[PDB]
Amino acid sequence: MREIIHISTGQCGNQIGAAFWETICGEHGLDFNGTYHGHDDIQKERLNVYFNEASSGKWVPRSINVDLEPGTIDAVRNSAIGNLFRPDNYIFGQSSAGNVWAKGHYTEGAELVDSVMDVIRREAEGCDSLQGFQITHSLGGGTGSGMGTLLISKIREEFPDRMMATFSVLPSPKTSDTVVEPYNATLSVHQLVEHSDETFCIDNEALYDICQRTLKLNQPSYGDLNNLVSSVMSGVTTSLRYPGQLNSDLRKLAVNLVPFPRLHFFMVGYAPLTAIGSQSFRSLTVPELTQQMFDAKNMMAAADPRNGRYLTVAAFFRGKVSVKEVEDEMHKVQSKNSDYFVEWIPNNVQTAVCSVAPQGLDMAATFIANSTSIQELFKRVGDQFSAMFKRKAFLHWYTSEGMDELEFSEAESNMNDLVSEYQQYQE
Amino acid sequence: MREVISINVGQAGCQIGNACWELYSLEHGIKPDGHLEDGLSKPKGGEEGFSTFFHETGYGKFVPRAIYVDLEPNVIDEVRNGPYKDLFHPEQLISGKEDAANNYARGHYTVGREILGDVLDRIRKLADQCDGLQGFLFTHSLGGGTGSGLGSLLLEELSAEYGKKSKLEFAVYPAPQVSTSVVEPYNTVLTTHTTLEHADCTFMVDNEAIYDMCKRNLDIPRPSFANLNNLIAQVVSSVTASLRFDGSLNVDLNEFQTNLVPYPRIHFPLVSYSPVLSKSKAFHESNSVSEITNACFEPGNQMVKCDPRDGKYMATCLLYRGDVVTRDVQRAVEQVKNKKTVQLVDWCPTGFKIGICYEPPTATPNSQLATVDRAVCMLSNTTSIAEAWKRIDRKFDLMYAKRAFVHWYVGEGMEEGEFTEAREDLAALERDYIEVGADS
Amino acid sequence: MREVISINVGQAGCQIGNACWELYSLEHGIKPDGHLEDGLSKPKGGEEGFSTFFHETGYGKFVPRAIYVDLEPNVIDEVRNGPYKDLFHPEQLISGKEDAANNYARGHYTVGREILGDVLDRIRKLADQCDGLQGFLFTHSLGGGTGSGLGSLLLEELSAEYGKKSKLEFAVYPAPQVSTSVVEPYNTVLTTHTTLEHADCTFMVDNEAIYDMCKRNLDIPRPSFANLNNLIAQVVSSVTASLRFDGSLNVDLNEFQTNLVPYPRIHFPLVSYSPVLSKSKAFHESNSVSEITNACFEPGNQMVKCDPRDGKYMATCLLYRGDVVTRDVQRAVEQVKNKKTVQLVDWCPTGFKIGICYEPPTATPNSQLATVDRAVCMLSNTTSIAEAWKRIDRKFDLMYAKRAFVHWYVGEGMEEGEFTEAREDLAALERDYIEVGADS
């Protein structure tokens, strides 16, 4: 169980998955056509993990891109890097989800669920070493919130032994193109908290703040945000991508990061998230990377760890660092932040250092924290729930779609069950 | 009693074995091809050694008897790429596709017991090829539950199979300060009770103490796991130095057992190796035998994160390498008794074992070592081990109150009763260890 | 018991010790690099030295057992640049991480004993390397409060540890006219308080009188600190020459203690050495040791701002190096009996402790004093230092009443009673020296 299939869905998650493969072939070394160029043997085993060995030494990515509007998947297919894509990888339909949780799965998903399960079954028959799925979608997008929650429930019902891992981006509560976007997110997480075992919190507004501080650009580019979350995903899977001092599996990380089947939400953090050229001004040191991981605004979840309470923390490093050095650093930050860090564990730290370093960086780090202030990120969405359809505006659309108030109260009770676990376990 | 079967279990255990076989080849000057290496000596094998760890073939190629068992294909592919696999036999190694668990759940479950029958006949076939047997050597770290679980399963099967040779088990203890794995104290406690029923002699070595040694003695800025493996290789080679090379006072494997296992339930000897220093410190001035014997009692050389002064003295061993003056270690041992560094006892104290071997210590090119014609390996039985036992037990009891993980263990292969029994057994070992030590 | 351990504390202490080892190796024909060079060469072995100070370890190097302790990293870097660091050991030379204060307020605080714990085990290790001890040697200065602080604290610790060996403390006393640091009055008074706690023998030396000698006798325009260190290296070489080389009248270091402390409390005898003249003047003069003895009684050859002619005569040591004519000293003791210039006291009168050394004196080429084959050392007790301490006590009392610095002292961890007892003790020392003089 070493192979992982990267699932792709959502009108914006397809670009995340496409950028994921681009950084993969750019980190280990692979041509756009499919001929192998990595070095030397450990990377070739990773090609067997993420790709399929085709004829004439060609490689094809093991990705399942299922969305609507096939003009988008055809446009990215004509790309140079997207030339090794197998026609069976992407299974797209027509034409648009209308940005609503109902039309995503209840109406259109009912006719495509049989096709996507046959594809994922054919992929499971070709490769039996599958251990988990990597799904990148948009929680606020119509195709993402609709189709994503259905395939996750279908995988959980049919494949309960296989692990789950998602990289869904959370909708911004302050700005939004429409009021139905966070509503579809709430209707999606109503089933994600039960059918998924692991998820990562990504906030678009947090991505907008990190490029204004580090990248220093007025208009945030979605391509750069895709590259940032790609380096985060690459830095997380480096425990299996490259052998190091201590390699851990996604199951070994899960059984140590959550005490209960709950706590699927995770705060993401990348290092070095420094500005362009700042590596020459400031020396790349491990105390600086720890200070960046401790910053509230540097996180892309995004939550305030000071206002919350550290439940479980995990910082995986890459490069050439000393074991005793990071042990003294993690001991100092746990003593000086004894109010933030929980004390009955008492050591809730779980590190996994990688031997090699990413290209262009002498050392990297991926920090995953569990705070109690994340309930406020759910409360504001829960408050938007009681502040958008409380006026009964545009309710005739949902009644015609077939949705009822029973699922809305169930989604509200799920948020109530979450914030209860946030205070069980009081902050 | 001329063969010792060594088994490498777990990821860290396989790395320790590779370092042990590498240093064993460096002492005898053995290259990947060999045929002895080459056939001119006398005494690099044959005669003994190597005839205790390296299997002799008809062609003369010494095959080191090692059983690399692991369920991680990456570690198995790593040990197969190097020339070590060419030295061993392709059928002696066991390959696994999917790791057991994190870490002791499936390592001791019936899934890990499916290969128990396969490796059992492999040992029986390996014993049928060779002649004689002195004991069973084990190299697995207690931090890894997979290595601790599989290593205990091999220990229980070998006890019910032959039960005629003393079973040695080299255990690596994690750092008592910081623990990377949250179930690491759980895997260690559950394994201590199992090794209690099976192992006739154990070995307690801490990783943090080794890291403090190379940073202070060897003066290296960046410690590495390869340095820890090399230091363990120097430790294991110092234990069996007499069995590999003849000396003025040759000691047996039964000699250690009749010096390290003094009670119905006492099988926990501590290891100390002196002198260990940098090359620069040896360039300035040399060291006398009295300074080395006094350095054996320091907390750094004890390879354990605990002070030996608070412990009570028990029967100990001291192996000496190269040329060693009998009176110099006699004049040193009488001063040690007069210094009263460790609190002596009224019953045991006349137990400072002196063993001499002609083979001088060898310094690996990867890890520094104090270049000296004579080395000292002290196998002590001081009562500071209970302090290390109570130290890891308090963290075990503090965690077990909420334990945050009991649902995974009770579902796969365990239950809350086994954790309670292991806790009561560990507390019983600590109580019996203090009672037998404080009664003086 | 013949061995002697030397300690170097403070910036001036290391510089004095460096010149001391430089002159030592220069007398026995030893290069400052090592191995050897050369010998242990007729008779650089027995009779020791060079084995009392330049101990020959198993490595084959005559390492001088010296402890260079100073909280200033610059002084540690200076002693490391010289080749004697290669002769020494990094454990012998204790590096200073940070300077305590300016310069005694924190040197004698807990920060001092924090480093004392490290140097104590080094002394225990040094004692285990070389057994036996004759007397503790100290080299520091009163201008540097850190040197006078750490040196006195270590002196009090070893006296409470053994208390059986002599304590020779070399303290550089500042001139009463110059105050390079306004903190030194409090340091000198508190140092005299610590000597009342433990002091076997303390040597007083003023840099003003030495610099005056280089300007007048050595014809040096600007006397440097190196010439002062070389002169102190010469006076300490002649004192220890009774133990290093052979002679008809060999004087023990403890015998010197039973020659310098007549009264129930005597800790501060003055020193004097002669002849100290120019190179061209040494070639022009060929006087015997009789004129050298007459010149040593003069205050010019005292190297201290004290007049032995004004003060009353007391117990004094007359050491001679090189070719010594017993009739010449007979004529010398005849003339001093004919002088009757100082008060011929009643308990002492017939005492000038004779010291004979067959080895001719040797001077460094850097020093302007030419190598003379005859030297006389008069180490006398004089009541003039009581007047010097009274002047220092008056300046300290004026500053103490003004309390301009006591506020910063009590913030460092001082108390009003501590300075009061130091003043009462210092006033008792001056009163005691007045009594032993006026009792004639």
From Swiss-Prot, chains B, C:
What is the predominant subcellular site recorded for this chain? cytoplasm
Record-annotated residues binding GTP?
Q11, E72, S141, G145, T146, T180, N207, N229
State the Gene Ontology terms under molecular function.
GTP binding; hydrolase activity; metal ion binding; structural constituent of cytoskeleton
Q: What single Pfam family name could you report for this chain, choosing any that match?
A: Tubulin
Superkingdom assignment: Eukaryota
* Any one biological process term the GO annotation gives: mitotic cell cycle
Q: Where do the annotations place Mg(2+) binding? A: E72
Tell me yes or no: is Magnesium among this UniProt entry's keywords: yes
Active-site residues are E255
Gene Ontology, cellular component aspect: cytoplasm; microtubule; nuclear periphery; nucleus; spindle; tubulin complex
Q: Where in the cell is it found?
A: Cytoplasm, Cytoskeleton
Keywords, ordered alphabetically: Cytoplasm, Cytoskeleton, GTP-binding, Hydrolase, Magnesium, Metal-binding, Microtubule, Nucleotide-binding
* Keyword Signal attached: no
EC number of this enzyme: 3.6.5.-
**What PROSITE patterns does its record include?**
TUBULIN
Effect seen on changing D252A: Poisonous alpha-tubulins that cause lethality. Microtubules do not depolymerize
| Reactions catalysed, as given in the entry | GTP + H2O = GDP + phosphate + H(+)
SMART domains, per this entry?
Answer: Tubulin, Tubulin_C
Q: How does it assemble?
A: Dimer of alpha and beta chains. A typical microtubule is a hollow water-filled tube with an outer diameter of 25 nm and an inner diameter of 15 nM. Alpha-beta heterodimers associate head-to-tail to form protofilaments running lengthwise along the microtubule wall with the beta-tubulin subunit facing the microtubule plus end conferring a structural polarity. Microtubules usually have 13 protofilaments but different protofilament numbers can be found in some organisms and specialized cells.
Q: Which family does it belong to?
A: Belongs to the tubulin family.
Mind telling me what this protein is named? Answer: Tubulin alpha-1 chain
Q: Which organism is it from?
A: Saccharomyces cerevisiae (strain ATCC 204508 / S288c)
Gene name linked to the record: TUB1
